Amino acid sequence: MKISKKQIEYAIEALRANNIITNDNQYPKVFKGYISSFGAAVIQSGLIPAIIFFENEDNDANADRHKIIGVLKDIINAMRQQYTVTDATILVSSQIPANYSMAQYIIEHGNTDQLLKEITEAAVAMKLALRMYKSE
């Protein structure tokens, strides 16, 4: 598949908003491994356990690993916005609340592979957009 420009744009906005990229266009150098490991873990262990692992805040991690889940949430919200609204569309388009954590959201609304597909594309977009910045 090709690279979706709109998803890369959402990734840029979400990376800036969720405080992964500093003002001098830099990141703490552990986040690229975080995103690549997130993709691999989603493939190898399943969506819910990988989301729980990377969304955990009581971790002995080098940096704030839970910020990548916020970036994922922002990208998914942005792409669910501008979803076309036709009565033949399989997509939900309902926006994930900022109150909700990602894991509970997938638990209580998770019966369809729409979230899996959107998360895979969002992770790929994060991976490709983070290459535009430098690592401290």
Partner 1 sequence: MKYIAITLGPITRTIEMAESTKELWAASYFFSYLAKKIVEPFVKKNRTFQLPLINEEMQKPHCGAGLFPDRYIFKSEPGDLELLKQHSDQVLIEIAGHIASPSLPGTAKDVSQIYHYLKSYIKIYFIERTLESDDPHVVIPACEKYLNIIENQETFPEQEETMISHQKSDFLKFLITNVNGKIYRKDKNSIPRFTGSFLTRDAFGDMNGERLFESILEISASELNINIQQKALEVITANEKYSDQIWDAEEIILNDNKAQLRPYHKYIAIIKSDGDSMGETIKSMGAYNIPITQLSKALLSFNIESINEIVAYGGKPIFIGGDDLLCFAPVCCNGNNVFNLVEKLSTCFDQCINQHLQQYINACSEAQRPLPSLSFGISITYHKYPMFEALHTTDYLLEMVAKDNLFKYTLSNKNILNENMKRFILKNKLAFSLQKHSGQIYHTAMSKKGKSYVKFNMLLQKYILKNKDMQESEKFLSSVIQMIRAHAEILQIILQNEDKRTEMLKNYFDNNFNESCHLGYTGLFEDIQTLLCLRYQENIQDYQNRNEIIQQNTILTSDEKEILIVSPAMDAIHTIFTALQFIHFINYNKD
Partner 2 sequence: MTTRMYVINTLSNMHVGSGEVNYGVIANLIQRDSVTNLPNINSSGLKGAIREYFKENEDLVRELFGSAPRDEKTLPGKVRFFEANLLSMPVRSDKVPFLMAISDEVLQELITKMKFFNCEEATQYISHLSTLLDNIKTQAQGTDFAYVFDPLLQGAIIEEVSIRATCPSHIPLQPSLKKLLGDRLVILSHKYFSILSDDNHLPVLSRNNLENGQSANLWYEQVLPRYSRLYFMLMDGNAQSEYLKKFRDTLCTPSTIIQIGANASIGYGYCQISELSPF
Q: Which residues bind partner 2 (CB under 8 A)?
A: 2, 86-91
Distance CA 38, CA 44 (A): 10
Q: How far is the CB of 130 from partner 1 (least distance, A)?
A: 8
Q: State how far Cα 136 lies from the chain centre.
A: 22
Alpha-carbon gap, residue 112 to 72, rounded angstroms: 18
Please tell me whether residue 13 binds partner 1 under the rule CB under 8 A.
no
Residues 116, 39 contacting (CB under 8 angstroms): no
Residue 86 binding: pick among partner 2, partner 1, none (C-beta 5-8 Å cut-off by kind):
partner 2
Residue from 12, 35, 69, 124 in contact with partner 1 (CB under 8 A):
12
CB-based burial label for 63 (10 Å; 0-12, 13-18, 19+): middle
91 binds, among partner 1, partner 2, none (CB under 5 to 8 A by kind): partner 2
Which residues are at the interface with partner 1 (CB under 8 A)? 2-5, 8-9, 12, 25, 128-134
